[PDB]
Curated annotation (Swiss-Prot), chains A, C:
Phosphorylated on Tyr residues after EGF stimulation. Dephosphorylated by PTPN11. The vault ribonucleoprotein particle is a huge (400 A x 670 A) cage structure of 12.9 MDa. It consists of a dimer of half-vaults, with each half-vault comprising 39 identical major vault protein (MVP) chains, PARP4 and one or more vault RNAs (vRNAs). Interacts with TEP1. Interacts with PTEN and activated MAPK1. The phosphorylated protein interacts with the SH2 domains of PTPN11 and SRC. Interacts with APEX1. May interact with ZNF540. MVP 3 mediates interaction with PTEN. MVP 4 mediates interaction with PARP4. Required for normal vault structure. Vaults are multi-subunit structures that may act as scaffolds for proteins involved in signal transduction. Vaults may also play a role in nucleo-cytoplasmic transport. Down-regulates IFNG-mediated STAT1 signaling and subsequent activation of JAK. Down-regulates SRC activity and signaling through MAP kinases. It comes from the Eukaryota. This is Major vault protein. It is found in: Cytoplasm; Nucleus. The chain holds residues 761 to 815 of 861 of the full protein. It comes from Rattus norvegicus.
């Protein structure tokens, strides 16, 4: 009884595994290429001065 | 009973995954190219002096 | 009685093992390649200045 249900919690957790995996995976692709285009369209010297706004 | 509903919470979370993904994805495109045009139309020396 | 149920908790924990394994495994792939693309699209000097925002 316990073997079968928990070997199934095995397969169910394999499932929930992949869900959380690709969840955060493509959320990561989202925010990472977000800030990719952010800073690439910014430019090296532009963001350097924007952050070095201090004498 | 638990297998089927939670393998479905698998597919539903795959769904909610992609929702949050492209949500923040295109919000990111939004704010990033926002500040892209901001600082590019500003110019290097302009923003340097402004800061 | 105890042997059989707990040798099964063996196989069930082998299962729960692999669930937690690939859970954190692909969550790791998620966040790691997230910050991969983050900092790679950033660039060496860009992130250096963004963090060296201080005189």
């Amino acid at each position: 009884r316990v073997k079968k249900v928990r070997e199934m919690e095995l397969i169910y957790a394999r499932a929930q595994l992949e869900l959380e995996v690709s969840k955060a995976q493509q959320l990561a692709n989202v925010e990472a290429k977000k800030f990719k285009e952010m800073t690439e369209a910014l430019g090296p010297g532009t963001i350097r001065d924007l952050a070095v706004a201090g004498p």
